[PDB]
Copies of this chain bind each other. A is one copy, B any other.
Amino acid sequence: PIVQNQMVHQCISPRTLNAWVKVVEEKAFSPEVIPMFSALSCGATPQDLNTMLNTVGGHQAAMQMLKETINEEAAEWDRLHPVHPIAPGQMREPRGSDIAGTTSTLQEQIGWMTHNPPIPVGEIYKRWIILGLNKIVRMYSPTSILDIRQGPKEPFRDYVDRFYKTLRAEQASQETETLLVQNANPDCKTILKALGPGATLEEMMTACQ
């Protein structure tokens, strides 16, 4: 990544590398994997981002979907930012493929990211990757919120956990009280109805405790 000390390039650490590999091995593409990726790739160059994605073994259906998303965003970038035999020793303008690190060198990437003003190719590429990762999360979300209904003897708290877990995956962690009540079991629904509208989640959970 690029870090302070002056802004200088640093090697990706074994700790960072292992942390990413392990979270994928344990969590696959549960929603919480996205903010972990984002956090672990803080200051990342496009090379660093490709490194992290490449260290993943398996999950290749998802990674191909990721590739396709990246290619679309790169095509759109080029449409919005067309580049014009470059002047000797001068910084060239990055194309989509340069941002994704397929046609740019590390030194070029460092040049853009540390320029004044910077062309933040690390942040732009991360944005495309996170967009692709959110799509994978939505695809792999196993259950519709319509099918999350409280069991006859399921504690209300356990039901609320499932409801908001499902909502998070279906929306890729991007921001329902009435539906929560509607999908509650008849005993807790009666109690929640009696609370009326404007009840907080805390109050609803206390009531069905």
Q: Are the CB atoms of A202 and B135 closer together than 8 Å?
A: yes
Which chain B residues border A40 with CB–CB below 8 Å?
14, 17
Interface residue? A51 (CB, 8 A): yes
Q: Are the CB atoms of A202 and B17 closer together than 8 Å?
A: no
Q: Are the CB atoms of A57 and B32 closer together than 8 Å?
A: yes
Which chain B residues border A30 with CB–CB below 8 Å?
57
A59 to B17, CA, bound (A): 23
Given known pairs A161-B58, A161-B59, the reply for A17 and B36 (CB within 8 Å) is: yes
Q: Are the CB atoms of B36 and A55 closer together than 8 Å?
A: yes
Residue of B nearest to A31 (CB): B57
Q: Which of A141-182 contact B (CB under 8 A)?
A: 157, 160-161, 163-165, 167-168, 173
Which chain B residues border A65 with CB–CB below 8 Å?
201-202, 205
Interface residue? A54 (CB, 8 A): yes
Which chain B residues border A206 with CB–CB below 8 Å?
139
Interface residue? A63 (CB, 8 A): yes
1/0 contact trace for A47-65 toward B, CB 8 Å? 0001100111111110111
Beyond A14-B16, A60-B165, 11 additional contacts (C-beta under 8 Å) are: A4-B9, A11-B42, A11-B43, A17-B39, A32-B55, A58-B165, A64-B160, A68-B200, A68-B201, A135-B202, A139-B206
The chain A residues found within 8 Å of chain B, CB to CB, are: 1, 3-4, 8-19, 21, 27, 30-32, 34-36, 38-40, 42-43, 50-51, 54-61, 63-65, 68, 135, 139-140, 157, 160-161, 163-165, 167-168, 173, 200-202, 205-206
